[PDB]
Structure 1
Amino acid sequence: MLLEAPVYKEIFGAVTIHEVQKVIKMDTTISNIPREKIYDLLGKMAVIVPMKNEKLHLVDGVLKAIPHKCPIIIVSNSKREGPNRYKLEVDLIRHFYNLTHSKIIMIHQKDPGLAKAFKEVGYTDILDENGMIRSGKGEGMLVGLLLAKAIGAEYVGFVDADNYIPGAVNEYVKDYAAGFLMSESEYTMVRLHWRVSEITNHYLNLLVSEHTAFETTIMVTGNAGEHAMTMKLAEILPFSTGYSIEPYEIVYILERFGKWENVEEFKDVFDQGIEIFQIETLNPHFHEDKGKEHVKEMLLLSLATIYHSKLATDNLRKRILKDLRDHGILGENEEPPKPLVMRPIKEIPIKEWMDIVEGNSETLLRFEL
């Protein structure tokens, strides 16, 4: 694969944010990551696919696009009765495995065996009030992260299921790989790119240029649904609820590692640094339209995340408030609610959590994995 070389970038504390790189030649001042090495790192990377009532044909399409050596981890939160939508997914995953023999782990987000392993090990941030796993994409992604960890993955990749272009999924995974192959740190994150988006980036760069007195544009993925991390970084990041999860990754990292304070706590991260790559994909971004109400909830908690940043300023908040209010989304004297943030899965006795899950969960399916 040929890419523009990571020539430029910006540096806040121990965080290196690279300028967006375009893919130049999809298959082989310019960087050259060969196919053999990409396809090579690939087997150490688990691709997590958060699923929810998605259409079976798009799901199938996405599944077929993941390169065979990537272990696939699926976490559905689909309607489970009237009709049992999950069973419909179980049927497809079973047919898919018979026709491909792809290594796949799948589980439902609301499975009682999951809530039990979480209570037992003392991790409660992911539970609703009834002690059941809370609905949300970040919530399912977190579960995916522990499963990927339970199988000893070094890198994790997220890809959505409502994609009209299987081919784009195939490129996302290879783009992640190249993103880690161009990295020098053990703590690396690769985010991808192709209005919610633009609005979130606008305020994210604003979040930074308020202290630096220089308006910036560096961040173009504040809202990347498609992204990836080295298990090492993923385990120390606290994760936010539902759709607020990718924006918060950025906000938390800047907040915690953008200055040199409390370095003794993360001595190794501060030394190696955090590297964030932003790769522009060749294939267009095309999802199922989920409707206007859905587009408004996302906008809401992605902007609420920036609003509560301990980095947000007087001015940053009002500008948000205004927009958030004159688009029929926030009260005229209402402040956006603080999105719930869950703690870093790090401290969890993984294999022990894995055996409680493995010995009490009715929805867990494993295939050569």
Structure 2
Amino acid sequence: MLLEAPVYKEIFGAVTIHEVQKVIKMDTETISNIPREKIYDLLGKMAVIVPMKNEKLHLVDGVLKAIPHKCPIIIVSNSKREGPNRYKLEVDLIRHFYNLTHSKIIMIHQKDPGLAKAFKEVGYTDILDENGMIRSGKGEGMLVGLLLAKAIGAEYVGFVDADNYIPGAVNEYVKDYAAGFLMSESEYTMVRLHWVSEITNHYLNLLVSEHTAFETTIMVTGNAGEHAMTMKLAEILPFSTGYSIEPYEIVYILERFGKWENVEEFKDVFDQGIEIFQIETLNPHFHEHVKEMLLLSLATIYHSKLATDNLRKRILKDLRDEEPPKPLVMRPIKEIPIKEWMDIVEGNSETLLRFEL
């Protein structure tokens, strides 16, 4: 692959946000050259997590068929389990798919009681609802996929949505993730793909412009659902849910590493730095309350130890023209004895499906 070289960028404390780069050429033997083979090497160390809930089976099928064989696939379904039992429909698709491709894949249902059991017996209750079960939501699904990914030794994790109309785009996202990591110089790296979102980008940059003093545009992937991170970085990040996930990752990262403090708490991170790559894909986005998305994204910014007295004012008046709801946040999953957690997920979960993984 060929991409524009990473030239321009801005720094905030220990955070480096690279200017968006374009993919210049897809298949390859001011321009970065990431050989196709270095990408396939990294691919084998990247878990592609797919949190899903009632998506169209023909779309899920295409996304699955597009993920590079090399990549382990982790599916966390919070699909409807009755009248009709759709998890059941997905289980069937997954095995047919495995029978035709031998892809390495793990699938589990979010409501698996053997899953909720591992979280408690391990002390991690941040992901449970009042009925003692894992709360429905996208962040929780991502958290489960994340731990599963850690349990199999993944070094990188990429997120992909199962309702893409363009399988080829999914194939490019994964490769673009790899490309982002291969151009990184830090073990704490995030890759966010790019092709409302501007209002989120407008305020995220503003979140910063208000103490650098200079208006910026550098941030352009604030609602980037298609993103990837190294396991090291994912594991120390508190996660939100719903539409707050993407913008919140950015807000938290600046909040905690935008200045230098408690450097002792996260030594290696402050020293190695956090890099955020923003790659503009070659393919367009096509998939299938803009008001909630919009309110939750901005709520993420309005509520930080870093939003100014004035920044909040505009958001407010922008939203109105009664404050924004504080976003649900779950603690990092780093201090979870992954093995113990996995042992009891394996010995108690009734929906876990393993195929050569």
Q: TM-score range by the shorter chain?
A: over 0.9
Q: Using the alignment, how far apart are the partners of 2:289 and 2:91 within structure 1?
A: 26
Gap regions ≥5 residues in structure 2 = none
Question: Is the aligned partner of 1:43 residue 2:28?
Answer: no
The C-alpha deviation readout for 1:8-51, integer Å capped at 9, x for no partner, is 10001111100000000111011000001101110000000011
Whether contact under 8 Å (1:75, 1:141) holds in the other structure is: yes
Paired residue secondary structure (2:81): coil
| Residues 347-366 of structure 1 aligned to structure 2 (within 5 Å) | 347-366=335-354
What TM-score does the superposition give when structure 2 sets the normalisation length? 0.98
Q: Using the alignment, how far apart are the partners of 1:79 and 1:325 within structure 2?
A: 35
Q: CA deviation at 1:84?
A: 0.7
The C-alpha deviation readout for 1:191-227, integer Å capped at 9, x for no partner, is 1000x21111111001000111101000000110000
Paired residue secondary structure (2:17): strand
Q: CA deviation at 1:336?
A: 1.3
2:317 alignment partner in structure 1: 322
Q: Using the alignment, how far apart are the partners of 2:129 and 2:290 within structure 1?
A: 24
Whether contact under 8 Å (1:136, 1:243) holds in the other structure is: no
Q: CA deviation at 1:314?
A: 2.1
Aligned-pair identity in percent equals 100
Q: CA deviation at 1:254?
A: 0.3
Q: Which runs of 4+ in 1 moved over 4 A?
A: none
The C-alpha deviation readout for 1:173-192, integer Å capped at 9, x for no partner, is 00000111000001000010
Q: Using the alignment, how far apart are the partners of 1:86 and 1:319 within structure 2?
A: 44
Q: CA deviation at 1:282?
A: 0.4
Q: CA deviation at 1:242?
A: 2.1
How many residues in Structure 1 have an aligned counterpart in Structure 2?
356
Aligned-residue CA RMSD (Å): 1.1
1:305 alignment partner in structure 2: 300
Q: CA deviation at 1:245?
A: 1.0
Which moves more between the two structures, 42-51 or 128-137? Answer: 128-137
The C-alpha deviation readout for 1:38-84, integer Å capped at 9, x for no partner, is 01110000000011110001100100000001000000111111111
Paired residue secondary structure (1:345): coil
Whether contact under 8 Å (1:50, 1:160) holds in the other structure is: yes
Correspondence for 1:294 among 283, 289, 292: 289
2:81 alignment partner in structure 1: 80
Q: Using the alignment, how far apart are the partners of 2:145 and 2:242 within structure 1?
A: 14
Whether contact under 8 Å (1:46, 1:157) holds in the other structure is: yes
Q: CA deviation at 1:131?
A: 1.3
What TM-score does the superposition give when structure 1 sets the normalisation length? 0.95
Q: Using the alignment, how far apart are the partners of 1:144 and 1:165 within structure 2?
A: 23
Q: CA deviation at 1:243?
A: 2.1
Paired residue secondary structure (1:156): strand
1:71 alignment partner in structure 2: 72
Gap regions ≥5 residues in structure 1 = 288-292, 327-333
Which moves more between the two structures, 313-322 or 13-22? Answer: 313-322
Paired residue secondary structure (1:50): strand
Whether contact under 8 Å (1:139, 1:242) holds in the other structure is: no
